Subunit: 206 residues, 8 copies
């Protein structure tokens, strides 16, 4: 039922992305961007479809996707964008700077819990069950499995719906300016990770 | 060292027609909702300081607050995350043009893990800071001679630290990093007052 | 089970001419200064419950508060240290005649280390409590049916729990120990509100 | 520094016709069921102390127990949680009109995490307590002058500490908080004797 | 299979003219000075068990205590450090001829770090031990059938386990190691009663 | 699945005229000085395995040791650090041409933190490895068929794992890193036997 | 006064006594890797014998005869270690022992510091230096400081035992201490056999 | 006597030898963020060469020739770090090395302290100060205390190595030590490739 377009290297064009907000996710060979290459970028406009883009080893360029990432009129939605921003900026040399993060939004609104993972959020906010089984798999394979392609699409298909709910909660609890300042700093927090401070809360006393 | 002591507020801003002011606070503790602001310290960088005693329940300090709100004047702190919280909580205005020597030390002094004011004054200025008066009753009606000297010393050197740290930030090409951190710092302090003082808001968990 | 849902307050105290009332609350979190009171639940012990939706900024609940301040009525909680704090912070009245089933469990169920409401209901009543709705948006304008049944079942069994624990407290000759703990509990909750929520005030360090 | 040394008990109560007495104890250790009470120290706050050696197997000390039972005389301890347990356990009498300087320190000295007797005596009185004789044989038939002086120095200043803490509790409006903690402290000590010494009875877990 | 429930004591020792007896206990908790002995379980190894309810304050159990003090009869426990301590504390007799399957397992089942009774019965005997009833009210006047069957299952297999462990201890030539551990075990339980329960008396620190 | 069981040694090397042999061991535990080698398992990668019971006190295994010493045959292990140590300790010969799938996994499966053989077989081969017989009595005279099948399953897949891991090592350009780790692996195992088993010899501290 | 010997005692003339204070120096805390280098003995008369042990030495007949003597109590501070390395080097496990650390843990219940330095400072007002503890004890020639540190760890063990024995009698723990000392050689054997990281009596 | 240079050794006249002592100073412990600032060399003759490395410098031909010479053993204390930052900066990973920290971990089994200061104090009775360690090593002009501190960290490595070789021989661990030194360049490569927080041989 869910249409998933799979691409090699880049989007063919931006026909599906003349929109004000785009959901973004990535798959990699690990959590360390200097060691673990970008393997997949996922995108959704919010219409129930997704694009899954395989990134080859040593790929330096993805003009259409990077046009989206640098377009200040388009908000990039992420879940825990701290990671996705870092590997994207590392790979293509462009740090997106108009972002919304559903993990940060959750930490500022779902104050009645300590579990802010995407699976827990989708279940509670949308009654949608996400599987994390394919997360630890070989994302650098020449041909992605059906299950990998569906996992990868599942991580962007719901971010618009989550963002809409979190914005209502941020308004209801009067934390919009707080959230906005956090989103403003998130790209620099990702840059700090790339520069060597990934283990350091830079605002902590010690 | 000339240390001018005041009750409630500065009498005027004659000593503060400057581009940056060093700011510090003493309190009854680390929890601003429980522990009242007790002293505000200022220095223009000229070797003198103003020590201002804040009374219990004091809601206003118009001259000092005009300094704190002046977007043309950078406020210099050491670990301003705490000072910004108690100042905004007490007088109702969050300064938003700031420089923090602790964030700056964490961005430049990468060869150490000690970023306290005493360690920094030692290494960068060969100045020895005493911290013995930090745990004392700062809400006392009359501050002791040693409290007043301690309270002054915490702002006397911040201008010199800033100038060194700015040189190192430039040398290592980290100016835009530090600027971005200083920009978020007031909101980081706000997040402390709102209830997130135990949470790294950017951590995975 | 019959569950009466109200906006703002009980309509009257016709169901609560009793010596003990079961009380519980739902909030937006564990930090009363940030996380508002959203729901208050009551039960007389007869299998029925009242679920009271508390609006944002609501300052009074005259009928509910009459019960909380009525010294002829014992208020039964599970971990009242929390409910007492958010009730007192929201409506300005700290209940002072209380029974806490968690303290009672810690004083009687010495053969275990789990003292949660779910474990206690399973062991003493063979009642299966579900905690799935605990993490939900309790500030929603319309509560879900799942939410309303969860909120109610957290008070339906406290009378039966209290009766069992009172027998255990008598068997093990610890009534006076428990009474003294119950008498301090309001002050323990007060201490949380004042800033000592992370401090065991009686510990050595 | 006048220190009267007695065996078994006070010879009489002539130095203790007062409304508050400073009390301390020395033991073979921290576990009252294994480690016997060895020394009981008293001071009226006049700069003298009575050090009372307690014998192995001793079940009574009538003059001391008359003081501890007297509802008209406040007993002042530093960390009376422990002293109350070992005295109630040895002589059968739990004092219930008490003042504890450690609890008072935690309620007032919010600018610090150090609440030992040494740190308090230094900051509030400029008095230097030595802790060297703390680990020594307090059951020794004959106590060294070092031991006798240590034992008396733990009661000589509690009156002066109390007065200062009373002024802080008044300044910060925590008088009724401190009172309620002092009221529960005997039960906190009873709880320790009954087997809950490792349990904060009010903790969630 | 056949479980015999007695009040207070065995009626006689007709079933216990044997060389070794499996012993187990149920209590109100892990702290013998606070948590009373409630049930004692015995088996001869013939597939039947005796389950003896011990009343509150019961000082005497003459047929049971005859077994405990009989130097010709090995008492078999699983983690007898605990059962020994509560029996000695309750009836005043410390058994000194013991075999512990948990110590034997730590000395023979070197290929694993799990040494509880459940995992040992599964591996050595393919017997499934349910631990659901471990946390129940063992001081209840009438014990449930589940309770009685759980309490008997903890002695029905200790003879079989002892035989297998003795074979493994002989295979690996550790018989004299185990014998000395069993000689010391009643003193290790005594050390717990005396106040050293948290202390490895043979550790460096 | 054909499994050949042998007492003492392989009858001959007819099935092992190959470039690489999968190797695994079963012991009485993780401490070679205490825990004797019990079983050695081999596979050529053809879907069959040989399982070799090693007797207590056995000092030679000529044909197996001939494979272990042959520099033209690569020995494949999962976590060979352990297997190399116990084979060297038992038969006095440390193999030196090895491939290890745990080290391989740590150098290629950077997208996970679980590098156990069960998890690797699951993800790379869709083969379900049961670890239930792991904690069993490997010194028994007669091994159960479940034990023999467990023992053979730990060598039946190591060839297929090796091939996949070699493709990953080439794709990520870590062949020479892996090779230096394997070259050092026998000395890492010697270090374990000599007494450094708990020390990372390259760590700062 | 400190007598330094090679390999063994010349005779047992100084050791016709009830109790001997015993101590060792090694290359570390692992007896299977770290060899026995020195053995120190005192009779309690304020003198000591320091016995350099050679690499590969398998016997020391006069010392071993002391360690074997059921009539002579061997006194240690933390004999768990010394018994292990003596048994592992010479094949004989002493079985008549007294350990001041266990004694201290059973009597000095007002403290958590049971090191030999604290016990000496408190019970004897004697200051023990530990500087030479980490030094090359396999050196062919031991320094004067090394030789005195070696001796100082046995010169006081008789005085400590007598104090502890009074504390044990005062608190009625004589039979508790005796059973601990009874088990202690086996606790040492358990260390030798592979259980050195395991409290054998713990629940887990 | 300490010779201070900019960028590189002028020539190799003082280093026609078998073993050179090597050390580095940096802006921190992360080679990808914290640049190499100083390289220190000593021939063991009581003198030292202190070389200041400029920001962005990619070559130092005379120094790199020493590091590449298989006939010259490079001596380090905790070479795992120095090898990483040298290979990252100049592109050459030295492969004939000796590490006094690894050797201390293989010989000084009677202690758990293996820092350079602690080792220099016990084996040479030389007192090292770590006060200048936390300082701005990227300064255009190094202070006198910085230059002296930088030199002192190479001045004694030759003497430490001789003592450790005697210990390794006495305890029969020469081959064990040689294999650790052989792997050490790969241990440092592993760090640069992203495994600096992982013991690659641990079970988990
Ligand atoms: N090592 C490790 N990597 C993870 C873990 N979770 C996610 N990753 C890596 O991070 C990438 C993004 O995670 P995802 O967006 O699938 O949750 C994955 O493709 C995987 O490489 C984890 O728990 N451990
Ligand atoms: N940087 C970082 N990202 C993580 C970690 N664990 C999971 N992630 C990332 O966080 C997202 C999913 O985390 P979740 O919030 O769902 O637990 C994915 O982007 C995944 O790669 C981690 O430990 N560090
Ligand atoms: N952060 C957090 N909040 C909780 C947790 N459990 C309960 N709460 C909050 O505390 C309130 C107490 O309600 P109850 O636990 O009785 O449902 C809940 O409504 C919820 O807001 C928890 O585990 N973590
Ligand atoms: N202070 C605190 N309260 C909790 C926590 N988790 C649950 N609670 C509260 O404790 C009560 C029931 O907890 P339970 O004992 O059932 O686990 C509810 O009021 C619930 O909100 C916690 O982690 N901390
Ligand atoms: N075990 C132990 N007992 C202590 C410690 N500190 C004090 N004690 C015991 O507690 C008694 C009273 O303590 P004080 O009033 O001297 O602080 C002392 O005589 C001593 O028996 C300690 O740190 N450990
Ligand atoms: N429960 C407990 N009491 C202590 C401890 N240390 C000292 N005490 C008791 O506390 C008092 C002295 O504590 P301090 O002077 O450190 O505040 C004495 O009464 C002493 O017995 C400890 O570690 N635990
Ligand atoms: N507090 C506590 N007590 C236990 C626990 N397990 C067993 N007990 C107590 O110890 C007694 C003996 O345990 P059992 O022989 O049933 O395993 C039980 O009757 C019960 O009172 C536990 O995990 N926690
Ligand atoms: N010290 C201690 N004893 C326990 C604990 N749990 C159970 N016990 C006691 O020791 C026995 C251990 O049983 P296991 O867990 O080995 O099957 C129980 O029967 C009970 O008597 C525990 O956590 N600590
Ligand atoms: N002590 C201990 N030994 C284990 C454990 N797992 C495996 N072993 C031992 O190590 C041997 C080899 O492990 P395997 O190859 O079966 O995974 C087993 O035969 C067993 O003796 C464990 O978790 N703990
Ligand atoms: N050093 C060590 N080895 C282990 C441990 N657990 C299992 N092993 C060994 O590692 C192998 C099992 O590896 P796994 O399947 O857990 O990756 C077997 O050879 C087993 O003996 C452990 O905790 N520590
Ligand atoms: N690794 C290490 N070994 C020690 C330590 N303390 C003592 N030793 C070793 O244990 C031996 C016991 O002798 P003593 O410590 O009484 O001088 C010493 O000779 C020394 O080899 C320590 O802290 N660490
Ligand atoms: N397990 C252990 N034993 C030590 C340690 N330090 C010293 N020892 C042993 O304990 C003896 C002295 O004990 P201490 O005086 O340190 O309490 C030494 O001779 C040595 O055998 C240590 O850190 N750990
Ligand atoms: N962050 C941090 N860096 C250190 C520390 N010690 C040394 N460094 C860095 O590592 C370099 C190594 O030089 P050394 O420590 O040999 O003087 C130093 O120049 C310094 O940059 C430390 O404790 N913390
Ligand atoms: N990982 C780590 N390395 C250090 C630390 N301090 C110093 N180092 C590194 O280790 C080298 C030697 O340190 P040392 O062994 O003297 O303590 C230094 O030159 C520096 O490169 C530290 O705290 N942690
Ligand atoms: Mn992601
Ligand atoms: Mn994803
Ligand atoms: Mn400040
Ligand atoms: Mn200050
Ligand atoms: Mn609740
Ligand atoms: Mn509830
Ligand atoms: Mn005291
Ligand atoms: Mn005292
Ligand atoms: Mn049991
Ligand atoms: Mn049982
Ligand atoms: Mn294996
Ligand atoms: Mn296996
Ligand atoms: Mn020793
Ligand atoms: Mn010694
Ligand atoms: Mn260095
Ligand atoms: Mn250096």
């Amino acid at each position: 039922m869910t249409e998933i377009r799979v691409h090699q290297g880049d989007l063919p064009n931006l026909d599906n992305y003349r929109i004000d907000a785009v959901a973004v996710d990535t798959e990699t060979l690990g959590l360390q961007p200097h060691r673990d290459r970008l393997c997949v970028v996922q995108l959704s406009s919010g219409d129930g479809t997704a694009d899954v883009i395989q990134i080859a080893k040593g790929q330096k360029s993805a003009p259409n996707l990077v046009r989206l990432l640098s377009d200040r009129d388009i908000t990039k939605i992420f879940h825990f964008g701290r990671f996705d921003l870092a590997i994207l900026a590392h790979t293509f040399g462009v740090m997106p700077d108009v972002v919304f993060c559903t993990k940060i939004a959750s930490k500022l609104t779902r104050t009645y819990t300590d579990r802010h993972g995407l699976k827990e959020i989708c279940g509670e906010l949308l009654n949608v069950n996400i599987s994390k089984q394919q997360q630890s798999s070989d994302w650098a394979a020449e041909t992605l499995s059906r299950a990998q392609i569906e996992y990868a699409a599942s991580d962007v298909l719901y971010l618009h719906r989550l963002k809409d709910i979190f914005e209502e909660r941020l308004k209801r609890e009067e934390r919009e300016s707080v959230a906005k300042a956090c989103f403003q700093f998130l790209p620099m927090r990702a840059n700090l990770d790339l520069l060597g401070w990934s283990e350091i809360d830079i605002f902590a006393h010690s």
